[PDB]
Design a protein around this motif. Structure first.
Motif, PDB file in Angstrom:
ATOM      1  N   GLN A  47       0.719 -12.134   3.792  1.00  0.00           N
ATOM      2  CA  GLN A  47      -0.403 -12.964   4.206  1.00  0.00           C
ATOM      3  C   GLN A  47      -0.113 -14.427   4.119  1.00  0.00           C
ATOM      4  O   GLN A  47       0.057 -14.981   3.026  1.00  0.00           O
ATOM      5  CB  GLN A  47      -1.605 -12.664   3.356  1.00  0.00           C
ATOM      6  N   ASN A  76     -10.813 -13.453   7.121  1.00  0.00           N
ATOM      7  CA  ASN A  76     -11.150 -12.835   5.834  1.00  0.00           C
ATOM      8  C   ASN A  76     -12.084 -13.732   5.029  1.00  0.00           C
ATOM      9  O   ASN A  76     -12.373 -14.853   5.423  1.00  0.00           O
ATOM     10  CB  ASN A  76      -9.887 -12.569   5.021  1.00  0.00           C
ATOM     11  N   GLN A  80     -12.527  -8.219   4.708  1.00  0.00           N
ATOM     12  CA  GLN A  80     -13.290  -8.508   5.933  1.00  0.00           C
ATOM     13  C   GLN A  80     -14.819  -8.604   5.693  1.00  0.00           C
ATOM     14  O   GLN A  80     -15.588  -9.089   6.546  1.00  0.00           O
ATOM     15  CB  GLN A  80     -13.015  -7.443   6.984  1.00  0.00           C
ATOM     16  N   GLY A 102       2.182  -5.842   3.370  1.00  0.00           N
ATOM     17  CA  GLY A 102       1.421  -6.876   4.044  1.00  0.00           C
ATOM     18  C   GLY A 102       1.836  -8.245   3.531  1.00  0.00           C
ATOM     19  O   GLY A 102       1.925  -8.461   2.336  1.00  0.00           O
ATOM     20  N   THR A 107       0.817  -1.207   0.000  1.00  0.00           N
ATOM     21  CA  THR A 107       0.000   0.000   0.000  1.00  0.00           C
ATOM     22  C   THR A 107       0.858   1.268   0.000  1.00  0.00           C
ATOM     23  O   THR A 107       1.977   1.279   0.533  1.00  0.00           O
ATOM     24  CB  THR A 107      -0.934   0.046   1.214  1.00  0.00           C
ATOM     25  N   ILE A 148       3.518   0.533   3.065  1.00  0.00           N
ATOM     26  CA  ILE A 148       3.423  -0.595   3.979  1.00  0.00           C
ATOM     27  C   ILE A 148       3.319  -1.889   3.195  1.00  0.00           C
ATOM     28  O   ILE A 148       2.639  -1.955   2.186  1.00  0.00           O
ATOM     29  CB  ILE A 148       2.226  -0.475   4.942  1.00  0.00           C
ATOM     30  N   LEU A 157      -6.587 -12.784  11.433  1.00  0.00           N
ATOM     31  CA  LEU A 157      -7.839 -12.153  11.053  1.00  0.00           C
ATOM     32  C   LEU A 157      -8.696 -13.037  10.178  1.00  0.00           C
ATOM     33  O   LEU A 157      -8.195 -13.603   9.216  1.00  0.00           O
ATOM     34  CB  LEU A 157      -7.536 -10.870  10.272  1.00  0.00           C
ATOM     35  N   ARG A 164      -5.241  -1.019  12.933  1.00  0.00           N
ATOM     36  CA  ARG A 164      -5.421   0.411  12.710  1.00  0.00           C
ATOM     37  C   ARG A 164      -4.411   1.247  13.482  1.00  0.00           C
ATOM     38  O   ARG A 164      -3.747   2.108  12.925  1.00  0.00           O
ATOM     39  CB  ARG A 164      -6.833   0.762  13.118  1.00  0.00           C
ATOM     40  N   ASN A 183      -6.400 -15.420   7.957  1.00  0.00           N
ATOM     41  CA  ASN A 183      -5.278 -14.683   7.432  1.00  0.00           C
ATOM     42  C   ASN A 183      -4.307 -14.325   8.563  1.00  0.00           C
ATOM     43  O   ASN A 183      -4.597 -13.458   9.387  1.00  0.00           O
ATOM     44  CB  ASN A 183      -5.803 -13.441   6.697  1.00  0.00           C
ATOM     45  N   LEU A 198       2.293  -6.878   8.972  1.00  0.00           N
ATOM     46  CA  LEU A 198       2.444  -5.569   8.348  1.00  0.00           C
ATOM     47  C   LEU A 198       3.782  -4.928   8.755  1.00  0.00           C
ATOM     48  O   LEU A 198       4.102  -4.819   9.939  1.00  0.00           O
ATOM     49  CB  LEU A 198       1.301  -4.655   8.748  1.00  0.00           C
ATOM     50  N   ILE A 217      -0.744   0.674  12.151  1.00  0.00           N
ATOM     51  CA  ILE A 217      -0.500   1.360  10.897  1.00  0.00           C
ATOM     52  C   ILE A 217      -0.273   2.837  11.144  1.00  0.00           C
ATOM     53  O   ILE A 217       0.742   3.425  10.722  1.00  0.00           O
ATOM     54  CB  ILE A 217      -1.666   1.183   9.954  1.00  0.00           C
ATOM     55  N   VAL A 273      -8.907  -5.912  14.438  1.00  0.00           N
ATOM     56  CA  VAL A 273      -9.018  -4.869  13.400  1.00  0.00           C
ATOM     57  C   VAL A 273      -8.518  -3.532  13.949  1.00  0.00           C
ATOM     58  O   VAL A 273      -7.832  -2.760  13.262  1.00  0.00           O
ATOM     59  CB  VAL A 273     -10.492  -4.758  12.888  1.00  0.00           C
ATOM     60  N   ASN A 316      -8.697  -0.022  -0.248  1.00  0.00           N
ATOM     61  CA  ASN A 316      -8.160  -0.438   1.032  1.00  0.00           C
ATOM     62  C   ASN A 316      -8.418  -1.932   1.227  1.00  0.00           C
ATOM     63  O   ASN A 316      -9.496  -2.425   0.833  1.00  0.00           O
ATOM     64  CB  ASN A 316      -8.801   0.357   2.165  1.00  0.00           C
ATOM     65  N   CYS A 317      -7.453  -2.646   1.817  1.00  0.00           N
ATOM     66  CA  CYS A 317      -7.537  -4.109   1.946  1.00  0.00           C
ATOM     67  C   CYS A 317      -8.743  -4.585   2.761  1.00  0.00           C
ATOM     68  O   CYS A 317      -9.148  -5.750   2.667  1.00  0.00           O
ATOM     69  CB  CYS A 317      -6.276  -4.675   2.596  1.00  0.00           C
ATOM     70  N   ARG A 318      -9.311  -3.690   3.558  1.00  0.00           N
ATOM     71  CA  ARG A 318     -10.399  -4.057   4.488  1.00  0.00           C
ATOM     72  C   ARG A 318     -11.614  -4.720   3.814  1.00  0.00           C
ATOM     73  O   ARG A 318     -12.450  -5.324   4.477  1.00  0.00           O
ATOM     74  CB  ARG A 318     -10.862  -2.822   5.260  1.00  0.00           C
TER      75      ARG A 318
END
Ligand SMILES: Cc1cc2nc3c(=O)[nH]c(=O)nc-3n(C[C@H](O)[C@H](O)[C@H](O)COP(=O)(O)O)c2cc1C
Ligand SMILES: Cc1cc2nc3c(=O)[nH]c(=O)nc-3n(C[C@H](O)[C@H](O)[C@H](O)COP(=O)(O)O)c2cc1C
Lengths: 121, 135
Positions: free
Chosen positions: B124, B93, B56, B122, B20, B120, B91, B78, B103, B107, B81, B74, B51-53
């Motif tokens: 996984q 996903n 979710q 990530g 990102t 950043i 997490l 935040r 996942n 990060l 980051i 989550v 955004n990767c969110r």
């Protein structure tokens, strides 16, 4: 449509962090192919092509040391390091190392992110 | 001589990678690798700039994060980051097809010139889970 950096995954379990995976940017930029690097330690990048058998003197041994401490103590690293392509051409490597903890809260892997910068003679 | 192709061992890539842009607002994705595409079922063109969110959400037609993904984790993400530090955790996903993915996400921030964060990364590791939202 390409990754901005090299990616390298090593096995933190086996002795001396053998490479288990490199990405295509790594291959294109460094001139090495996944097959010739798999199983080796990344430190061959500090030797001027595949027929130099010693670390090159312009490779910052202070940074190499910090990298060693970081890997050993299971922590993050960022720094910059002279490396060389397969053909001996130099390369500035802005390197980030980050460990992966597995199921056992043990480090299983280390990820290297390589942002390559350019050249000189 | 005949050239030697790049990427003969993609099939040995152990993890997804996401990059990102830390400068644009809300960490837009600028790159995802092929393991990410394959596992999540989302292909690069549909995820770039977002955004990767979205992972979710249970698939592409759910606007908001599914109630089963850990709102506490989550939140730690935040925090991490925004605090320019590294993160690792697990997490829930969902693939595009709606199936659960566990996942194991790490990060790490990339400092550029200026000792300022430009990217950043990530990583996984998709691991096994007993989570199962039935038929
Ligand atoms: C995942 C990973 C990626 C690495 N990538 C590089 C690299 O791109 N260039 C480099 O010079 N060293 C890299 N290294 C560092 C070397 O493999 C080694 O740890 C370093 O040379 C210090 O060890 P030494 O004192 O035994 O040589 C990497 C290490 C790891 C674990
Ligand atoms: C490089 C990067 C990769 C990420 N990868 C994932 C991911 O694979 N899955 C996920 O659920 N969230 C991922 N995220 C996290 C979300 O994009 C977001 O930061 C998180 O949901 C917490 O913020 P929010 O509450 O504002 O949504 C990633 C974030 C970054 C910066």
């Amino acid at each position: 449509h390409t990754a901005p950096c090299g990616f390298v995954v090593t096995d933190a379990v086996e002795p001396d962090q053998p490479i288990i995976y490199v990405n295509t940017v790594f291959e294109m930029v460094t001139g090495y192919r996944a097959e010739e690097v798999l199983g080796r330690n990344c430190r061959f990048l500090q030797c001027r092509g595949p027929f130099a058998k010693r670390r090159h003197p312009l490779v910052d041994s202070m940074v190499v040391s910090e990298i060693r401490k970081c890997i050993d103590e299971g922590i993050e690293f960022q720094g910059e390091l002279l490396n060389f392509r397969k053909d001996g051409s130099p390369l500035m490597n802005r390197l980030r190392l980050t460990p992966i903890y597995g199921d056992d809260d043990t480090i299983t892997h280390i990820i290297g992110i390589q942002f390559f910068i350019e050249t000189d003679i």
